């Protein structure tokens, strides 16, 4: 904590990838005042922050960042005027106009289905949730919606962010954004609700494909690492998600079995023989899927995404509570992403001057900048 000022000064002077950052938020300079009308919000010492900050170009941003040395950096929306001049504008005229479509996934939202961590804690046993969350959401954005430019970022403590930056996506309204969220959402209800997933008879392709993703991980994550069917205290939470008329049949089988794998197979067979609708003789795995979805499907903080003017932490900003750097995630190596090897600001400041040019390529931050650059090159191609 007390070390942050001098470390931040070195970080913002020799390590922050300014050229790549400007390339991103300038979007080729094709539109006028697109970067000049962008809100940045800097958090300083003592939880003090300033909103409606904007800059004229890359140089002006470098000088202001090296002058303020903010603990945290938030990106806002592109406004109708210079945010830093918003007080000169007549009331009602200053309006948010465009912003990337953003998603924020917090591991805390899985506390009800996590047996290893709680609150802002994370560990390798439960990080697979984020692995599934990236694969499920990113597929839907890419394949179902046609979005081509998606930057996934480690938030620095307990989850991940996604920046969808296609120029028409940046123009979407709040209504369409919330509609996209609704399309993507399946786990609904707070701690009040016991069963948070309910499927229809007809399965929409989105649901099928997400389930097929979860099936690739469910054994190692849920039945081994989490051991969701370890004892009665654990498998009673799953029995709370199925009808009561099959509790007894499962209770016995679980006690006769010895581990979660066997008990899960019993659950699948029993659930597939349960008769939902007495009119027809139709049976299926709806319950099986509802359980898997309730334990593995992305839980999206809905309000982050519907608001055009919502602030989100900038990539390559530091998390002031962990010292970690918000780094992009290599989509080609999503399963191998290890949040516990993400460098802290102290670590890369050490690597810079550690004896065995003086920039980020001399540290462990480089490969993450390469991920960011591949993202930027795809954007450049889309413009040509
Ligand atoms: N006080 C605040 N005012 C305005 N925006 C705020 C804010 N505190 C946070 N935000 C914005 O919400 C994003 C998500 O919050 P959180 O999930 O707690 O932080 P994070 O950046 O995702 O990092 P983690 O702790 O989740 O890993 C913030 O990024 C943004 O500032
Ligand atoms: Mn978050
Ligand atoms: Zn954990």
Curated annotation (Swiss-Prot):
GO cellular component annotations of the record: alpha DNA polymerase:primase complex; membrane; nucleoplasm
Residues the entry annotates as binding Mg(2+) 1: 104, 106
Protein name: DNA primase small subunit
Entry superkingdom: Eukaryota
Quaternary structure and interacting proteins, as annotated: Heterodimer of a catalytic subunit PRIM1 and a regulatory subunit PRIM2, also known as the DNA primase complex. Interacts with PRIM2 (via C-terminus). Component of the alpha DNA polymerase complex (also known as the alpha DNA polymerase-primase complex) consisting of four subunits: the catalytic subunit POLA1, the regulatory subunit POLA2, and the primase complex subunits PRIM1 and PRIM2 respectively. Within the complex, POLA1 directly interacts with PRIM2.
GO MF annotation terms: DNA-directed RNA polymerase activity; magnesium ion binding; ribonucleotide binding; zinc ion binding
Impact noted for substituting residue 301 to N: Decreases the binding affinity for NTPs
Organism of origin: Homo sapiens
Binding-site residues, Mn(2+) 2: 104, 106, 301
Protein's gene: PRIM1
Annotated residues for binding of Mg(2+) 2: 104, 106, 301
Binding of Zn(2+), residues: 116-117, 123, 126
């Amino acid at each position: 904590p007390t070390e942050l000022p001098e470390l931040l000064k070195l970080y913002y002077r020799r390590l922050f990838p300014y050229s790549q950052y400007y390339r991103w938020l300038n979007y080729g300079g094709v539109i006028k005042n697109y970067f000049q009308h962008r809100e940045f919000s800097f958090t300083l010492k003592d939880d003090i922050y300033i909103r409606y900050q904007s800059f004229n170009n890359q140089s002006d941003l470098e000088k202001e960042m090296q002058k303020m040395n903010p603990y945290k950096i938030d990106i806002g929306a592109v406004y109708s005027h210079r945010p830093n001049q918003h007080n000169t504008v007549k009331l009602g005229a200053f309006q948010a106009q465009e912003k990337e479509l953003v998603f924020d996934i917090d591991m805390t939202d899985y506390d009800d289905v996590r047996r290893c961590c709680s609150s802002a804690d994370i560990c390798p046993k439960c990080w697979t949730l984020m692995t599934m969350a990236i694969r499920i959401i990113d597929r839907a954005l890419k394949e179902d919606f046609g979005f081509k430019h998606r930057l996934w970022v480690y938030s620095g403590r307990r989850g991940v962010h996604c920046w969808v930056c296609d120029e028409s996506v940046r123009k979407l309204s709040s209504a369409v954004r919330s509609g996209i969220v609704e399309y993507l959402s399946l786990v609904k209800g707070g701690q009040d609700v016991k069963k948070k997933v309910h499927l229809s008879e007809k399965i929409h392709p989105f649901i099928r494909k997400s389930i097929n993703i979860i099936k690739k991980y469910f054994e190692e994550y849920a039945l081994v690492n989490q051991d969701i069917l370890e004892n009665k205290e654990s498998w009673d939470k799953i029995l709370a998600l199925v009808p009561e008329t099959i509790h007894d049949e499962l209770q016995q089988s679980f006690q006769k079995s010895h581990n979660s794998l066997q008990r899960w197979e019993h659950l699948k067979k029993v659930a597939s023989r349960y008769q939902n609708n007495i009119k027809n003789d139709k049976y299926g795995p709806w319950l099986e899927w509802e359980i898997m979805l309730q334990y593995c499907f992305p839980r999206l903080d809905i309000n982050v995404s519907k608001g055009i003017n919502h602030l989100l932490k900038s990539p390559f900003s530091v998390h002031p509570k962990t010292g970690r750097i918000s780094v992009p995630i290599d989509l080609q190596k999503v399963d191998q992403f290890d949040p516990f090897t993400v460098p802290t600001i102290s670590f890369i400041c050490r690597e810079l001057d550690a004896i065995s040019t003086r920039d980020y390529k001399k540290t462990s931050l480089a490969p993450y900048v390469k991920v960011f650059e591949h993202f930027l090159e795809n954007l450049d191609k889309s413009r040509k």
